[PDB]
Write a protein that binds this ligand. Structure first.
Ligand SMILES: CCCCCCCCCCCCCC(=O)O
Ligand code: NI
Length: 134
């Protein structure tokens, strides 16, 4: 299909709200939170055959996940959590669910009014990061 085509490309952060709150919720220490809060990472979304790849590149930490929609995969997050993940795409919302230690967090990407909105949710901690395509 072509459902993912609109997401493919290079995206740069233009705005962020409550990232600190989301990070601390995850157990990320103060020193790391300051450094992470200063960065403007670039996420690169790409497709190869049936497999999607999502790279996050910054002057601080770099990560990369590869997955097929609806298929579980192992992931080591930037804050070093070893999680089991699953990514699905429904109604144009790319939903990434991470599960570890009996708890979970979601990372949701949607294209709205010319921006990519990434909503990060861990319990009542909800962060919104805004990206724009290059
Ligand atoms: C670049 C973030 C450095 C600090 C690592 C904190 C890890 C929090 C989970 C990953 C958050 C990534 C959000 C995003 O892609 O913009
Ligand atoms: Ni296409």
């Amino acid at each position: 299909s072509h459902m993912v085509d609109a997401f493919l490309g290079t995206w740069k952060l233009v705005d962020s709200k409550n990232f600190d709150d989301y990070m601390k919720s995850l157990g990320v220490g103060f020193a790391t939170r300051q450094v992470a809060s200063m960065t403007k990472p670039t996420t690169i979304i790409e497709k190869n055959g049936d497999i999607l790849t999502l790279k996050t590149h910054s002057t601080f930490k770099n990560t990369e996940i590869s997955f097929k929609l609806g298929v579980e995969f192992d992931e080591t997050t930037a804050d070093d959590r070893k999680v089991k993940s699953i990514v699905t795409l429904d109604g144009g919302k790319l939903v990434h669910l991470q599960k570890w230690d009996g708890q979970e967090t979601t990372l949701v990407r949607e294209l709205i009014d010319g921006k990519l909105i990434l909503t990060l949710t861990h319990g009542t901690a909800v962060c919104t990061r805004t990206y724009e395509k290059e």
